[PDB]
Ligand binder design. Structure first.
Ligand SMILES: O=C(Nc1ccc(Cl)cc1)Nc1ccc(Cl)c(Cl)c1
Length: 127
């Protein structure tokens, strides 16, 4: 593909912890285009978590992460960040970022042609 995505910043954490995921884009990038984080637990479909697009850096969040997540981008670093706070075991999944040749952020995975590999996020009851 003309753009490659590589996620980092996943981890193994405890309930209540924070993690900052990063998506580093390379190739023929255009930073106002929609960047969308999805997550996928085993057996389950990928679901939208958060996304950013457009000239205002407009953020959209799934109800699942209502009040716990902040998405942002740094155009000079071609990087999108997803800060997740107050993590809980139900958040465990592989998080992957995806992009498409439009500033329009959409919640369907179907409309994104370009995907990263994913990073693992595991949240366990403290111990
Ligand atoms: O480049 C991007 N997205 C992007 C978004 C934010 C940052 Cl910081 C960096 C890159 N998309 C894109 C670009 C070209 C094509 Cl063909 C397609 Cl299909 C998608």
């Amino acid at each position: 593909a003309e753009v490659q995505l590589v996620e980092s910043g996943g981890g193994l954490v405890q309930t209540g912890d924070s993690l900052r995921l990063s998506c580093a884009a390379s190739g023929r990038t255009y930073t106002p285009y929609a960047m969308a984080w999805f997550r996928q637990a085993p057996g389950k479909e990928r679901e939208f978590v958060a996304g950013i697009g457009g000239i205002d850096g407009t953020a959209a969040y799934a109800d699942s992460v209502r009040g716990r997540a902040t998405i942002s981008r740094d155009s000079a670093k071609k990087t999108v960040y997803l800060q997740m706070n107050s993590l809980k075991p139900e958040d465990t999944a592989v998080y992957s970022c995806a992009t498409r040749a439009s500033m329009q952020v959409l919640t369907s995975p179907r409309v994104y042609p370009i995907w990263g590999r994913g990073t693992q996020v595991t949240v366990s009851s403290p111990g």
